[PDB]
Design a protein around this ligand. Structure first.
Ligand SMILES: *[C@@H]1O[C@H](CO[C@H]2O[C@H](C)[C@@H](O)[C@@H](O)[C@@H]2O)[C@@H](O[C@@H]2O[C@H](CO)[C@@H](O)[C@H](O)[C@H]2NC(C)=O)[C@H](O)[C@H]1NC(C)=O
Lengths: 213, 219
């Protein structure tokens, strides 16, 4: 059965540029190709149907082209709302098959993270748990290191991280770092520290609190 | 005005059947195909099968043996049944309209299916209020830590949806068979705590909702 290969897994570009995401079929006498946009955490939207036709309410800067094997979704004048995964569906033969997709990355200016640290809630403590949370919000590029320190000494154990996708407005990323300890460990120490190292400064951004204060 | 809405189980035990209902509006099942497609965690989309306008069905040969697709014309519902679920049937399951007998023009919201033996566990929701007045910034960031739930997903909003600018809801992480996520919101400092901020967490699998108000700390 027909494979749709999208050889770029990630495609990089600037606001107002032109980008082509390509999709190369394993067979076909077809213009039986549809193109979709899936923005993070929601459902796909048809952009282009029958290789080179525009779905209603799709703005004029999205165009499609190609025959047989190779197909090209062109995005002119890229906007930040175009942050999404773009993929083709082959509908010439059964089974219908999908490209694995190209996530468009938008290049923007370096921005430093806004860092905030939060002690365990007292609700969490009354339950025997103690999570310390640190948000590093709205920074670029994505590359970032978080160091946790307890009474001045690095903890790598019990730190769980999670990154958002690139924001569709400001093209930034954000990250959440949670240090999970038990209440029993948490109460034996005073000083808790989140340190964010980002290319935007050679100095770490340091957020801390004392449990006793 | 074409809409499609999956309703499914959220959690399914190994070897039990999945069934999902796709309720549609804005077209007639009679005139258009409806396909079922899925997206397992970090993999391509996979088409499962279709039921066309005139009633006939084709399936992906991979699933033929345990798939069935039917519909109820009078309710505008397409039903999927997939038997013998194994953990690798975990995925987001979508139904989608066709343009008659051609293009898949419109996609439903998707419903998450996790194949697992374990219990449903609701989240504990913990408010994240800043530590002792760590200065005036003109903005304050607040959060909810949503800990200890299974399966995915949870939905987070703030003041029931009125507060949507400057929200980050992070993907969940899995530790010791339970998920955890956190969400932040940033509002002007003059306005909190005088104008209240509450995160609302829905965990559909467990039919639970918690609305947690963020109050400044006592410490
Ligand atoms: C990305 O693709 C566009 C359009 O693609 C069509 O034409 C090229 C030559 C072909 O390989 C297929 O990809 C398509 O059939 C490239 O061409 C320009 O862009 C516009 C659309 O924005 C086209 O309609 C124009 O024909 C062409 N400009 C002209 C003739 O002045 C474009 O080069 C390419 N960009 C990159 C960076 O590869």
């Amino acid at each position: 059965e027909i494979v749709m290969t999208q050889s770029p897994k990630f495609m990089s570009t600037s606001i107002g540029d032109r980008v082509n995401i390509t999709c190369k079929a394993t067979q076909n006498v077809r213009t039986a190709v549809t193109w979709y946009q899936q923005k993070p955490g929601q459902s796909p939207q048809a952009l282009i149907f029958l290789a080179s036709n525009r779905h209603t309410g799709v703005p004029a800067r999205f165009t499609g082209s190609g025959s047989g094997t190779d197909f090209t979704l062109t995005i002119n004048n890229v906007k930040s709302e175009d942050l999404a995964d773009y993929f083709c569906l082959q509908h010439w033969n059964y089974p219908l098959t999908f490209g694995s997709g190209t996530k468009l990355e938008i290049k923007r200016a370096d921005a430093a993270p806004t860092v905030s640290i939060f002690p365990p809630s007292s609700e969490q403590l009354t339950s025997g748990g103690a999570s310390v949370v640190c948000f590093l919000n709205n920074f670029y590029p994505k590359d970032i290191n978080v160091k946790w320190k307890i009474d001045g000494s690095e903890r790598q154990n019990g730190v769980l991280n999670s990154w958002t996708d690139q924001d569709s407005k400001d093209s930034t990323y954000s990250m959440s770092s949670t240090l999970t300890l038990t209440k029993d460990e948490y109460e034996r120490h005073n000083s808790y520290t989140c340190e964010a190292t980002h290319k935007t400064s050679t100095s770490p951004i340091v957020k801390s609190f004392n449990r006793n204060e | 005005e074409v809409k499609l809405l999956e309703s499914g189980p959220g959690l399914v035990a190994p070897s039990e059947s999945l069934s999902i209902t796709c309720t549609i509006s804005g077209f007639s099942l009679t005139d258009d195909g409806v396909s079922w497609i899925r997206q397992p965690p970090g993999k391509g989309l996979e088409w499962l099968g279709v039921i066309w306008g005139g009633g006939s069905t084709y399936f992906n040969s991979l699933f033929k043996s345990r798939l069935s697709i039917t519909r109820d014309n009078s309710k505008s519902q397409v039903f999927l049944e997939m038997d013998s679920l194994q953990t690798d049937d975990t995925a987001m399951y979508y139904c989608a309209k066709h343009d008659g007998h051609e293009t898949m023009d419109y996609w439903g919201q998707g419903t998450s299916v996790t194949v697992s033996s374990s219990k449903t566990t609701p989240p504990s929701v913990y408010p994240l209020a800043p530590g002792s007045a760590a200065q005036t910034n003109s903005m304050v960031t607040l959060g909810c830590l949503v800990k200890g739930y299974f399966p995915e997903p949870v939905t987070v909003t703030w003041n029931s949806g009125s507060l949507s600018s400057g929200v980050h809801t992070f993907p969940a992480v899995l530790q010791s068979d339970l998920y955890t996520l956190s969400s932040s919101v940033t509002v002007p400092s003059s306005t909190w705590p005088s104008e209240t901020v509450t995160c609302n967490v829905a965990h559909p699998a467990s039919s639970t909702k918690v609305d947690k108000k963020i109050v400044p700390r006592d410490c």
